[PDB]
Design an enzyme around this catalytic site. Structure first.
Site: not given
Ligand SMILES: Cc1cc2nc3c(=O)[nH]c(=O)nc-3n(C[C@H](O)[C@H](O)[C@H](O)COP(=O)(O)OP(=O)(O)OC[C@H]3O[C@@H](n4cnc5c(N)ncnc54)[C@H](O)[C@@H]3O)c2cc1C
Ligand SMILES: N[C@@H](CCC(=O)N[C@@H](CS)C(=O)NCC(=O)NCCCCNCCCNC(=O)CNC(=O)[C@H](CS)NC(=O)CC[C@H](N)C(=O)O)C(=O)O
Ligand SMILES: Cc1cc2nc3c(=O)[nH]c(=O)nc-3n(C[C@H](O)[C@H](O)[C@H](O)COP(=O)(O)OP(=O)(O)OC[C@H]3O[C@@H](n4cnc5c(N)ncnc54)[C@H](O)[C@@H]3O)c2cc1C
Ligand SMILES: NC(=O)C1=CN([C@@H]2O[C@H](COP(=O)(O)OP(=O)(O)OC[C@H]3O[C@@H](n4cnc5c(N)ncnc54)[C@H](OP(=O)(O)O)[C@@H]3O)[C@@H](O)[C@H]2O)C=CC1
Ligand SMILES: NC(=O)C1=CN([C@@H]2O[C@H](COP(=O)(O)OP(=O)(O)OC[C@H]3O[C@@H](n4cnc5c(N)ncnc54)[C@H](OP(=O)(O)O)[C@@H]3O)[C@@H](O)[C@H]2O)C=CC1
Ligand SMILES: N[C@@H](CCC(=O)N[C@@H](CS)C(=O)NCC(=O)NCCCCNCCCNC(=O)CNC(=O)[C@H](CS)NC(=O)CC[C@H](N)C(=O)O)C(=O)O
Lengths: 488, 488
Positions: B461
């Site tokens: 991840h």
């Molecule tokens: C400290 C830490 C580090 C981690 N690092 C990694 C990593 O490096 N790489 C990796 O692959 N995984 C990592 N994990 C694991 C990863 O976060 C989970 O495995 C994964 O996100 C689980 O997702 P999920 O679909 O079960 O929902 P989750 O992402 O666990 O979220 C569950 C959601 O349900 C909500 N919820 C809880 N109870 C209720 C309720 N009563 N009613 C309504 N909503 C509720 C919560 O608010 C939460 O937002 C890490 C976990 C922890 C804790």
């Molecule tokens: N991000 C981590 C993974 C970890 C992570 O974040 N994981 C999950 C949850 S566990 C998550 O949250 N993912 C979402 C995330 O990280 N999102 C970041 C990107 C957000 C996407 N934004 C949507 C809009 C689309 N964006 C684009 O297509 C990029 N830019 C553009 O479209 C604009 C207009 S063209 N600018 C440029 O492209 C640059 C313009 C230039 N610099 C100039 O001079 O003009 C990774 O990739 O390593």
């Protein structure tokens, strides 16, 4: 039977959110997503984004990168990067501050996603089951709380995931967990991490980086070797390298009693019966699935060993329309797994064209100070159910570490093969850039590769990943579960 | 026809040594290896080890790592790493000196290999050909030099590799090359790198790291886009990132006159007809195969475009017993390719069972300031001799760079696929950890791979490599060599 919502997902979790998004945008079903709160929080920790965005893989990662800088700085000294090696101090404050500024924007990324997406609605409370079609939303985890919303739906998907396992001892409430770890006002001087899991070790690494003068980080573990489940040669070699980084490991040691002092620090009584004083003490015992307050009983969904919601290989529960994914299931708990279980669910029950999630040959990583990247079977487990197995070993110390002074950051590779057909069953790596390499290794194993497939590829000359295609002759063999050198 | 040596390898190159070593140990044949000198040297550059160990990849990479620190240091400042933002000063000397420490150590472990191995011997001088079975060793490239040894062998293998191309202009001799760069007394303040090749760029990065206060590093190029041969979108984005890193790129610019000053600096007249002063000026024009002295004519071995030795796909030359490998063959020239060509040779003519070298789907890397990982076909090339093709693109800016202050270190991927087949023909990456990831990518592609093979794999991840398995929608298409978005 025309109901209000096509789907109600409990938990904006990385697994929950993905499913809810997919169904509403590709399949245009009406989806409602329930979760505790708006953004990452001190009173309730998880929120919109899931455990990994708010109190997991995302913020954690940044803190490991920050702590990793400690070594990089001292190291650069050997490359001619001279400076005042005591101008240097780590400001834990500016870290959490800059960490919060980032998580916050992801939370603000989602808020706008919901108002931009037709079919998606975020409902904020505590989800509970009334029956197979009716989800109650409460303002408290306490069942006696206020009926805030009542949502009528065709499908229900539980994605509430997991929650810290605290240990029942005198003073248990004096400790912190991974959750409160992220919101510590100040950097711990004298630090104790308890346990021996991914999180115990990753965090040990973090505090070891952001410790002030005279600070130290002990890590205690019930068992005799840390991180049970990984290559037992990788486990041993990390221990050495953590020791060499400053993290004082302690095996076969487990606290009994914790009590607060006149200074406000916490005092710890041990298994061997000794006492030490730490500013802080963090519990990394594991994570029990989070179904404690859902009332699955009320609607007839079968729990197991500690609330684990039992599902078939398609994520369906006891009831024909209710589902569970992520960590609550108790299958392998990872972000990209919960994501896959979620997306497979979607194609299955809304895409008409069904699908199931491949659970083996999944590559994961441990973001410890020297990162670990594994994929496939352990050395032991492959020797158990497979008849003849070969072990390929290679431990080298990269060029730069002769200079950087860290002549202990030895990169390690372990490959486990089925001797019969040559197939690759497990690859294990310790060293920098390990989680990066292992990723494409997992593509190669789900592909179904063999040791021949590896060495028969031409490499990139100065990389550490090139030494993957360099293991021809095996180090030793496992002939029907025994320690063997030869075969004839 | 019993002869003194079974093999005489003409050059202790990456490929040279590997070949010599192999036959001598696994096949116990008598081998003799001829090279210019003993340890890495300033008068004669390459020595026992190859153009890679002494004046190539090994010491080069140490310097790229040292220059990389400049960013890492300033970047840590965002993670809470407070210190004297001007205590920091790079010492070019402690680097080169600690660089030699390492290279010299390699040369020292080689010496001991020769004393330790039965069948292997090192002979020191400049090898030339007397006939098909006789190699002469001289103390000069001058053919009127002294006859130092004369070796009676069954096989000859030419692993002399390559040698810097200078350009014919006034002041050509006032410049430095790849070679002398490695022994520069002091860090060049005002610096000009010439050309747009691997070493032109990699080196630009190096000086830009070890430049002292007020110093700058220009880069000029004949053509209008750097590094022709890589993904044309990676090429663009690198230029931008170099610009933003401190390197003044200048296209369509090519010097004519160089004349020395009365302070000691060199003076430069350009293609546009302008003048500038630089402390040093490094040529990175090309590397002509190094056969221009060997007298292949006097033995009947056919040279080609710039002395490139013509060989079949098994490395055999114009003669039945003479071979050539590595850079001198003029197939695309890298260490692990010379290594493969040399080991193939061994199984071919000594292992009895013959073998060919796969020259396509070789994963290589460019160790620029943001590293490049590429493997397979360019866009422009797959759009040609493959009927219908897809382009998968995705650029993101990694989690940490919101904090580190480098909001320009956008990691980039583009995958090139056969539409009809689904096959993965080319993968291209720009960003940190790119050379590491790409390595296993090349195992996947030699193995034969599909875009469907990628997104069917679960991810690790918090990585950059995980984004490989999340590309389903193509960005656009090439329908029989034509830029399209739709198809029919
Ligand atoms: C400290 C830490 C580090 C981690 N690092 C990694 C990593 O490096 N790489 C990796 O692959 N995984 C990592 N994990 C694991 C990863 O976060 C989970 O495995 C994964 O996100 C689980 O997702 P999920 O679909 O079960 O929902 P989750 O992402 O666990 O979220 C569950 C959601 O349900 C909500 N919820 C809880 N109870 C209720 C309720 N009563 N009613 C309504 N909503 C509720 C919560 O608010 C939460 O937002 C890490 C976990 C922890 C804790
Ligand atoms: N991000 C981590 C993974 C970890 C992570 O974040 N994981 C999950 C949850 S566990 C998550 O949250 N993912 C979402 C995330 O990280 N999102 C970041 C990107 C957000 C996407 N934004 C949507 C809009 C689309 N964006 C684009 O297509 C990029 N830019 C553009 O479209 C604009 C207009 S063209 N600018 C440029 O492209 C640059 C313009 C230039 N610099 C100039 O001079 O003009 C990774 O990739 O390593
Ligand atoms: C600055 C630089 C950086 C590089 N970086 C990389 C990289 O990062 N990754 C990568 O894959 N490749 C890299 N390369 C290319 C790589 O070094 C070569 O492709 C590889 O070394 C070719 O090996 P070879 O078998 O032809 O013999 P070489 O390694 O080139 O060595 C040839 C040997 O033959 C000897 N010789 C020459 N003439 C005679 C003669 N007259 N008589 C006897 N001996 C002779 C030389 O002294 C030398 O030791 C780099 C090259 C350079 C110049
Ligand atoms: N991929 C990643 O980066 C991450 C993944 N995760 C996942 O989420 C889950 C969360 O677990 P996390 O806390 O590591 O811990 P996990 O259970 O792996 O590890 C728990 C650790 O605590 C030890 N332990 C259990 N009970 C006690 C006790 N009573 N006293 C002392 N020690 C005890 C266990 O030892 P023993 O082995 O002897 O039982 C084990 O070493 C894991 O299953 C993992 O798959 C979590 C964090 C990061
Ligand atoms: N994998 C790695 O990390 C490395 C691999 N190598 C290998 O060894 C070789 C070393 O590359 P090196 O010679 O930089 O560069 P390579 O020939 O790639 O590139 C030469 C560069 O110099 C330019 N050039 C050629 N002639 C002139 C001229 N007369 N005036 C101005 N510019 C000119 C070329 O431009 P134009 O495109 O117009 O010809 C081209 O950009 C390559 O063959 C490569 O395969 C080398 C270093 C590192
Ligand atoms: N090195 C780069 C690639 C660049 C490179 O140099 N490439 C090519 C040429 S272009 C090359 O030179 N390749 C070879 C190389 O770089 N080698 C570097 C290492 C030197 C050779 N290695 C010899 C040592 C072999 N090791 C062993 O046999 C393992 N055990 C030991 O050496 C000893 C004796 S068993 N003990 C231990 O390791 C354990 C001791 C323990 N710490 C304790 O406290 O007791 C990389 O790794 O990526």
């Amino acid at each position: 039977m025309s109901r209000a919502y096509d789907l109600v997902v409990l938990g904006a979790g990385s697994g929950g959110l993905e499913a809810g998004w997919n169904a509403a945008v590709t399949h245009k079903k009406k989806v409602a997503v329930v979760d505790v709160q708006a953004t990452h929080g001190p009173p309730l920790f998880a929120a919109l984004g899931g455990t990994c965005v708010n109190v997991g893989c995302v913020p954690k990662k940044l803190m490991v990168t920050g702590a990793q800088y400690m070594d990089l700085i001292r190291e650069s000294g050997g490359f001619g990067w001279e400076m005042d090696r005591e101008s240097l101090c780590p400001n834990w404050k500016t870290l959490i501050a800059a960490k919060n500024k980032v998580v916050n924007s992801i939370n603000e990324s989602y808020k706008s996603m919901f108002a931009d997406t037709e079919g998606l609605s975020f409902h904020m409370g505590f989800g509970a089951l009334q029956d197979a079609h009716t989800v109650v939303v409460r303002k408290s985890e306490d069942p006696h709380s206020d009926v805030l919303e009542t949502l009528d739906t065709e499908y229900i998907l539980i994605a509430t995931g997991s929650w810290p396992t605290r240990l029942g001892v005198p003073g248990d409430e004096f400790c912190i967990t991974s959750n409160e770890a992220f919101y510590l006002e100040d950097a711990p001087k004298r630090m104790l991490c308890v346990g021996g899991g991914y999180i115990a070790v990753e965090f040990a690494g973090i505090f070891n980086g952001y410790k002030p003068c005279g600070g130290y980080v002990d890590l205690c573990y019930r068992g005799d070797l840390i991180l049970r489940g990984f290559d037992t040669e990788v486990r041993k070699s990390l221990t050495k390298q953590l020791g060499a980084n400053g993290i004082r490991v302690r095996t076969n040691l487990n606290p009994t009693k914790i009590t607060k002092n006149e200074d406000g620090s916490n005092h710890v009584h041990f298994n061997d019966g000794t006492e030490e004083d730490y500013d802080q003490v963090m519990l990394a015992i594991g994570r029990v699935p989070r179904s404690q307050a859902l009332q699955l009983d009320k609607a007839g969904v079968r729990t197991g060993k500690n609330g684990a919601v039992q599902v078939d290989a398609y994520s369906k529960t006891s009831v024909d329309n209710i589902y569970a994914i992520g960590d609550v299931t108790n299958r392998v708990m990872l972000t990209p797994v919960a994501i896959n279980e979620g997306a497979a669910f979607v194609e299955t029950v809304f895409g008409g064209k069904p699908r199931a999630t491949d659970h083996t040959k999944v590559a994961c990583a441990v973001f410890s100070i020297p990162p670990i990247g594994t994929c496939g079977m352990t050395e032991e487990e492959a020797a158990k159910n497979y008849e003849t197995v070969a072990v390929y070993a290679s431990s080298f110390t990269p060029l730069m570490h002769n200079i950087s002074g860290s002549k202990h950051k030895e990169f390690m590779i372990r490959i486990i093969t089925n001797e019969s057909n040559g197939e690759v069953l497990g690859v294990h790596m310790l060293g920098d850039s390990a989680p990066e390499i292992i990723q494409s290794v997992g593509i190669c194993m789900k592909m179904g590769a063999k040791i021949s497939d590896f060495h028969s590829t031409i490499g990139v000359h100065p990389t550490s990943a090139e030494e993957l295609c360099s293991m021809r002759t095996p180090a030793y063999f496992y002939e029907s579960g025994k320690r063997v050198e030869k075969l004839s």
